[PDB]
Design a protein around this ligand. Structure first.
Ligand SMILES: [Ca+2]
Ligand SMILES: [Ca+2]
Ligand SMILES: [Ca+2]
Length: 423
């Protein structure tokens, strides 16, 4: 039987010549990162590893590494956006939006309902599909591989897009900015290599803010210097390199903290997310990677959400993503018949053309991406993205002495970020 292997090669020309020689079935490729995915028997994988001149590393593509998203519709009544009110001084910052909304926000996710009334004006036709023909491990025969197909099957990407860009009945953080969707999910799982390719594409398409509202726990064993490996180094290195490539193109990567309420500095707890007893470590990625704005989630009381991961040398900032504390406490019947979803959940755009109440770090993250786009445009920082990040942290966070280990630089404050001239 054949398995899917992640491969990091050394040279395009020599790798291509090797592919011809052995008739390797390459199922995905990312030339900018010298990484490809090959379907082959375990024996041919071992053999392929002996070509030290053309092959750097090889590892089986991780099956159970990506964390599952949440789109379950547990709605009809349309309430107010308490979460936006918390970061805009109760709507006062909408009067301070830049006149020229030039920055484009890329969103790497499940797709988007491009004709949603609140999202259509801001949807960019640069949007692209990174899901390959036949989808995940070739088990989705309905995935044509059509580069223009970014329709949202799962519903998550539409939720995220509303937070950055709704401009109608719902209002996102950057309602005048264009957003670009890079679809990396069909109807099943995604592959971190697709996410990596999406990052490269988003950067090449000139999106100065790149939002990744999904994450995974990956196994990395730095002590192992072998070519054929048991960890997931190819995926780890590819993702980190894509992020650094984005940085090189002057794009900012914003990622969601994991949604397991874990202190990422507690090794025992991280390893438990992959039931890993090996030598290496489990890492929350891309949240913990270099050059990533790591976003945690807060609730309606400005406290860290019970599901938000956090930690020293991890969390950079926090924004409202909601909570299920009332639900988990009282049960669905009392929670629902008594309208608690209107108090602790985030109201957002849904792929049915209407709206949905949800919660998660995936809904906090786009608020920060939107804020960065506003900062870049307000202060004309296109040529100096690091200055936009610095401004976000210094002037785009409320000062309430929240511990840095849980909230990073603080809770997002868009009104403050847009009023630096005011002093
Ligand atoms: Ca660029
Ligand atoms: Ca780190
Ligand atoms: Ca970070």
């Amino acid at each position: 039987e054949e398995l899917y292997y992640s491969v990091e090669y050394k040279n395009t020309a020599t790798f291509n010549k090797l592919v011809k020689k052995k008739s390797l079935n390459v199922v995905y490729n990312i030339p900018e990162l010298h990484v490809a995915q090959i379907k082959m028997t375990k024996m041919h994988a071992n053999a392929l590893a002996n070509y030290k001149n053309d092959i750097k590393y090889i590892n089986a593509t991780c099956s159970t590494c990506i964390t599952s998203e949440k789109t379950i519709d547990r709605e009809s009544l349309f309430s107010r956006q308490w979460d936006m009110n918390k970061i805009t001084n109760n709507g006062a910052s909408y009067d301070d939006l830049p006149k020229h909304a030039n920055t484009k926000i890329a969103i790497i996710d499940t797709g988007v309902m491009k004709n949603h009334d609140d999202l259509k004006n801001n949807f960019s036709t640069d949007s692209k599909n990174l899901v390959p023909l036949n989808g995940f491990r070739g088990t989705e025969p309905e995935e044509t591989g059509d580069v223009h197909d970014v329709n949202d099957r799962k519903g998550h990407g539409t939720m995220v897009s509303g937070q950055t860009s709704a401009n109608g009945k719902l209002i996102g953080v950057a309602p005048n900015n264009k957003f670009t969707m890079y679809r990396v999910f069909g109807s099943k799982k995604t592959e971190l290599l697709w996410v990596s390719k999406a990052i490269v594409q988003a950067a090449n398409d000139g999106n100065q803010v790149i939002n990744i509202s999904v994450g995974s726990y990956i196994i990395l064993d730095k002590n192992d210097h072998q070519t054929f490996r048991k960890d997931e180094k190819v995926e780890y290195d590819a993702l980190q390199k894509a992020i650094n490539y984005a940085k090189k193109k002057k794009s900012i990567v914003v990622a969601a903290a994991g949604n397991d309420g874990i202190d990422v500095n507690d090794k025992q707890k991280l390893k438990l997310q992959r039931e890993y007893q090996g030598n290496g470590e489990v890492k929350d990625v891309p949240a913990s990677m270099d050059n990533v704005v790591t976003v945690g989630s807060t609730d309606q009381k400005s406290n860290l959400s019970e599901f938000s991961n956090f930690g020293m040398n991890y969390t950079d900032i926090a924004a409202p993503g909601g909570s299920f504390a009332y639900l988990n406490q009282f049960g669905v019947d009392k929670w629902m018949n008594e309208g608690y979803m209107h108090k602790e959940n985030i109201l957002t755009t849904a792929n049915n053309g209407r709206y949905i109440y949800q919660a998660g770090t995936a809904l906090a993250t786009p608020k920060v991406s939107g804020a960065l786009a506003l900062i870049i445009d307000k202060y004309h920082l296109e040529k100096h993205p690091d200055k936009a990040i610095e401004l976000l942290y210094q002037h785009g966070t409320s000062k309430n002495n929240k511990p840095f280990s849980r909230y990073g630089h603080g809770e997002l404050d868009v009104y403050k970020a847009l009023n630096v001239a005011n002093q």
